[PDB]
Ligand SMILES: Cc1ncc(COP(=O)(O)O)c(CN[C@@H](Cc2c[nH]c[nH+]2)C(=O)O)c1O
């Protein structure tokens with residue numbers, strides 16, 4: 043296409059997008075498709091000659107959207123949110139067009155510099171300690187963008203195990219890094235995200251999930267008791283992943299207790315705040331951040347609740363030297379971010395993050411978190427009022443968990459009945475013996491009418507199953 | 510604050526600004542004149558409480574962003590390998606970003622998984638890869654997944670090799686620890702291989718040994734056979750070879766037809782890093798370097814280099830998806846088990862838009878033109894007797910230097926860097942300091958090549974009289 047044609051088709055894609063996002067409630071949230079559905083819809087080989095633009099654009103409705111799960115639907119209530127927004131779209135449009143890479147400062151200074159300043163903005167917005175800021179005069183730390191929390195949590199564990207292997211290597215400089223790795227043990231709550239076990243599997247570091255209390259929170263006592271048992275077995279505690287906003291029921295590990303134990307015992311403390319981190323924009327949700335000063339690293343996803351489209355992960359370290367010795371065989375104004383991550387190439391993700399922060403400003407991002415939380419509090423009060431249902435865990439943010447009283451099958455059957463029309467998207471989880479519906483408030487545009495309408499579909503399905 | 514009608518106006522503004530930026534990119538200084546830390550004093554120290562205006566945000570792009578940008582889309586960018594955007598790539602990702610679905614499982618958004626499965630089959634065929642790399646071929650146990658980098662794909666290939674080999678070592682030592690067993694393992698690559706190969710060694714705690722190469726910087730079967738015998742003799746267990754098609758430094762090619770049979774005989778995982786040259790395999794005439802590909806356990810290359818898909822977009826194919834998934838599962842296609850992270854985005858839309866918008870024949874004509882512009886550059890260096898060309902140009906990379914010591918070449922670069930009208934990075938084969946000249950932009954012309962050669966000539970004319 044000529045530049046003149048791109049200006050038309052760009053306008054055409056903007057108008058399509060504005061309509062799509064504005065009218066998304068009218069879509070079936072989950073597609074009715076079977077695995078393998080799309081192959082008979084596409085040619086077996088790429089086209090030799092150009093397909094016309096009208097044909098490609100036509101295929102968006104004709105063959106992409108019928109298989110999409112509309113994550114931007116207010117009726118999406120599975121997993122955790124992943125929100126886009128207008129500013130976010132416009133930010134990536136520029137980055138995609140410059141298409142620079144920032145493996146080093148030199149390879150595109152703006153890509154590193156904007157990211158450094160904005161991660162400092164964001165650490166401040168969250169109430170993170172000063173020792174995570176690139177520009178605090180005493181800091182050894184800073185923030186870098188990653189693609190996922192999964193990888194951020196893997197990088198934290200690779201930094202923890204390399205650091206502690208290098209310490210142990212000075213008493214045993216004949217011992218193999220990999221042989222010393224065999225003694226290490228890492229811990230997390232038994233509520234931790236699968237990415238914590240996946241980091242263990244990738245790194246061949248032994249990973250132990252610890253029991254939790256009545257609020258599904260990991261406590262000081264359980265970490266301390268595990269550390270004592272494993273040390274007396276000759277294992278070397280190296281790492282804890284403390285989760286602020288667990289996937290299942292959005293519980294919070296007890297940082298004021300886990301922090302001191304990790305510092306005393308020499309364990310790298312890594313905070314998975316994937317979802318809940320966005321809440322820390324608001325002062326009144328910072329209670330769960332108590333003990334943050336003991337963390338060696340912290341990660342959360344703006345790409346969940348903060349209205350930046352995926353990919354966008356915040357990761358902070360207290361000690362960037364420990365991070366870089368993980369990733370470079372030889373171990374605060376500017377840096378080469380290739381030494382803070384797994385790959386070489388990295389793109390200009392800071393543009394969309396910057397635009398979102400600037401376009402909303404901090405107050406409206408706070409208002410968004412408070413609104414989302416009130417919509418979940420509203421949803422909760424509708425469940426709580428209906429004596430067929432029960433709430434087996436506390437709602438702290440935008441996630442309500444509930445179930446029909448009696449056997450699991452009643453809850454299974456309400457889920458199946460709702461899956462027939464797919465007017466909302468729900469996914470079952472389990473907490474102990476209990477099957478539960480997770481209800482995640484998602485879209486920044488969710489209203490109390492959306493909430494009531496989804497509650498009434500759930501109630502109509504419960505009425506069906508109970509009669 | 511921003512409303513739907515504001516989005517529609519500012520989306521136009523951004524479409525117009527992108528079009529003007531890419532059409533006029535030759536007029537900018539490819540390399541910015543800034544020092545580390547320049548941006549901090551130009552930005553508030555804190556995020557704004559109230560919304561900044563769209564005039565201020567947009568204003569800031571030329572005012573404080575562009576002065577710190579390396580213009581990777583300039584025909585005058587000649588460092589690294591290319592990383593090319595294209596109109597159709599832009600339009601595809603606009604869609605993906607608005608839908609903003611995640612594809613960790615089939616179920617989390619079917620279209621994210623299926624369009625990727627089908628498009629990776631297209632791409633495998635366009636590259637002339639074996640049918641054992643296709644999702645939908647009857648005798649295939651393998652397939653293609655998109656990744657973010659060659660770096661991560663190479664790491665995944667090493668993680669799957671070492672996991673496979675450790676599960677096998679545990680048949681005979683069922684008490685030994687997975688990590689203890691990993692201590693015995695050894696992995697190979699060219700001494701020309703990319704830093705991501707050593708970096709995968711660092712991350713996995715797997716011993717890496719870099720082998721010597723021939724006159725043409727090519728890793729030969731004889732080197733690999735030697736290392737293997739010496740290492741087993743040491744009680745080490747060979748496990749992985751990464752062969753490079755298109756080395757970073759001089760765009761050399763490892764000898765696949767010798768390396769393959771050895772990995773197949775010795776049970777070593779053979780991973781192909783064709784990050785840059787992979788694109789040239791769209792053209793049947795460049796596939797001589799591919800010969801021996803039937804032996805590979807995996808292959809990666811970057812459409813995000815030369816094929817006009819904006820970054821990120823890496824193709825990764827495995828012969829054996831079960832080996833790949835055992836790496837990442839504690840035990841419908843769920844791509845979460847083919848990758849490190851959980852979440853993944855709908856990158857297949859931009860890839861499909863590019864392949865459909867250009868068609869194979871125009872992608873093919875882009876690779877040929879790019880190669881013809883490097884040929885033209887090579888013929889300008891070749892007629893000037895102050896310069897030597899110490900490796901063969903196979904594709905869009907030409908390496909050269911001033912004849913005489915390294916001080917001469919180094920000073921020519923230091924001179925060219927003063928105006929930044931083209932971007933060059935020093936590299937080195939052996940002791941010999943060279944200039945890398947990469948053809949980048951798909952809009953590159955004979956005029957652009959001559960203009961760039963003339964500025965390298967002027968800097969050489971100057972350095973040589975001093
Ligand atoms: C607590 C927590 N930790 C990590 C992750 C994984 O995040 P990445 O995909 O690695 O960035 C999660 C993920 N939560 C959902 C999936 C999802 C992703 N975006 C919204 N929701 C899940 O069901 O696992 C969580 O919760």
Ligand SMILES: Cc1ncc(COP(=O)(O)O)c(CN[C@@H](Cc2c[nH]c[nH+]2)C(=O)O)c1O
Pocket residue numbers: 143385386387388589590591592657658659660661703705753755756757782784785811813814823
């Ligand atoms: C041969 C080779 N293999 C891997 C990589 C790294 O690519 P990823 O960033 O991991 O996808 C490269 C990179 N080449 C250039 C940098 C670059 C990236 N895109 C264009 N150029 C380099 O100088 O290393 C190579 O070449």
